[PDB]
Design an enzyme around this catalytic site. Structure first.
Site, short mmCIF file in Angstrom:
data_model
loop_
_atom_site.label_atom_id
_atom_site.label_comp_id
_atom_site.label_asym_id
_atom_site.label_seq_id
_atom_site.Cartn_x
_atom_site.Cartn_y
_atom_site.Cartn_z
N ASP A 31 -9.30 1.32 6.51
CA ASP A 31 -8.15 1.67 6.83
C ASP A 31 -7.95 3.13 7.74
OD1 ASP A 31 -5.21 1.81 6.19
OD2 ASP A 31 -5.80 3.51 3.79
N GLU B 108 1.38 -1.19 -0.03
CA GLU B 108 0.07 -0.47 -0.11
C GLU B 108 0.88 0.96 0.31
OE1 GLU B 108 -1.01 2.82 1.90
OE2 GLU B 108 -2.14 3.49 1.42
ZN LIG Z 1 -0.17 4.54 6.36
#
Ligand SMILES: [Zn+2]
Ligand SMILES: *[C@@H]1O[C@H](CO)[C@@H](O[C@@H]2O[C@H](CO)[C@@H](O)[C@H](O)[C@H]2NC(C)=O)[C@H](O)[C@H]1NC(C)=O
Ligand SMILES: [Cl-]
Length: 314
Positions: A201, A154
């Site tokens: 997230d 990510e």
């Molecule tokens: Zn981050």
């Protein structure tokens, strides 16, 4: 197609209490979450131990999860390096899947270690705890099912750009876009069987506020709102206010970069469980176990597990 007209099977009060009771925040903390709070940027030994933990906690469950590791090399600002997204699928030949997703790397960085506690050990552990708390109901499913994705890479290794970020997700959205689905079908790919991508997230901080980001998931965000609301009324949430709700009547006016980006721009609908504003501790050494809030996370596990059962009609 069907994704657009798919409706949840809404569970009654009795069934709500069951879900609220059958999840353990302490089990998640000690067994799912603590082993992940390690430096685990992409290609590191910490990455491998995290990967091994994820798979292990998945294998140990009776639901018939099918694990697959999408490993690959990509050019980084530190040369080629290795990434490994982790996919846990029930019913891999089922046409449609509800997808849950976190990124399981930590961002490569005071004479302290960055462990991305909200970012995103907690989202992964929640995914894990969901898989455990729902194991028995998920076992029954053995043409819509569940997929878990843990994206690797990510984060930017150096400075967040189109090419320096989202290595995992961008490689996987493309894999999925060129892979026929169901197997031996014509015209339709694995993205296309993606009912809804639900990206957790930056979860774990006290008093998160999650915008409603996307019209084409707005009815799903609404379901989160009604869920929070009903779990609240039944006294099944802890330290919870209506004035301080997580799921607000707010639309967001900017664009956020994250793992959903390469799925979204290929037409996958997205329900993006990232708060705005970002936690106080974001991309600081302080994003640690200490700054996490137990009840918030416990609460969101219950909103999430209910959401998931309702979607799957379970
Ligand atoms: Zn981050
Ligand atoms: C609310 O929902 C639950 C679903 O779990 C209902 O419980 C089911 O009742 C049927 C009817 O006899 C049984 O076949 C199932 O075995 C029950 N499931 C479980 C897990 O016990 C419950 O009866 C419903 N209650 C109300 C008041 O609507
Ligand atoms: Cl390394």
């Amino acid at each position: 197609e069907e994704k657009n007209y798919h409706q949840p099977a809404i569970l009654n009060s009795s069934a709500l209490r069951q879900i609220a009771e059958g999840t353990s925040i302490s089990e998640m903390w000690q067994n799912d979450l603590q082993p992940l709070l390690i430096e685990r940027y992409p290609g590191s030994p910490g990455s491998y131990a995290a990967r091994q933990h994820i798979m292990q906690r998945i294998q140990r469950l009776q639901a018939d999860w099918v694990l697959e590791i999408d490993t690959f090399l990509s050019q980084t600002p530190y040369g080629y390096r290795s990434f490994s997204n982790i996919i846990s699928t029930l019913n891999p030949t089922a046409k449609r899947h509800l997808v849950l997703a976190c990124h399981y790397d930590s961002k490569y960085f005071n004479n302290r270690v960055f462990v991305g506690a909200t970012d995103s050990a907690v989202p992964c552990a929640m995914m894990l705890e969901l898989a455990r708390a729902l194991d028995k109901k998920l076992l029954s499913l053995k043409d819509l099912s569940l997929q878990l994705i843990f994206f690797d890479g990510e984060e930017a290794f150096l400075h967040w750009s189109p090419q320096d970020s989202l290595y995992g997700s961008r490689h996987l959205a493309a894999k999925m876009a060129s892979t026929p689905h169901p197997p031996g079908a014509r015209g339709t790919s694995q993205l296309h069987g993606m009912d809804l991508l639900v990206l957790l997230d930056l979860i774990g901080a006290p008093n998160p506020t999650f915008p409603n980001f996307f019209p084409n998931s707005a009815r799903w965000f609404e379901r989160l709102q009604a869920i929070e609301h009903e779990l609240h009324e039944l006294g099944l949430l802890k330290d919870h206010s209506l004035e301080g709700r997580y799921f607000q009547n707010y639309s967001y006016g900017g664009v956020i970069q994250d793992d959903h980006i390469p799925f979204l721009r290929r037409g996958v609908p997205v329900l993006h469980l990232i708060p705005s504003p970002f936690p106080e501790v974001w991309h600081t050494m302080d994003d640690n176990e200490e700054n996490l809030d137990e009840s918030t996370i416990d609460n969101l596990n219950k909103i999430l597990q209910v959401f998931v059962l309702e979607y799957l009609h379970l």
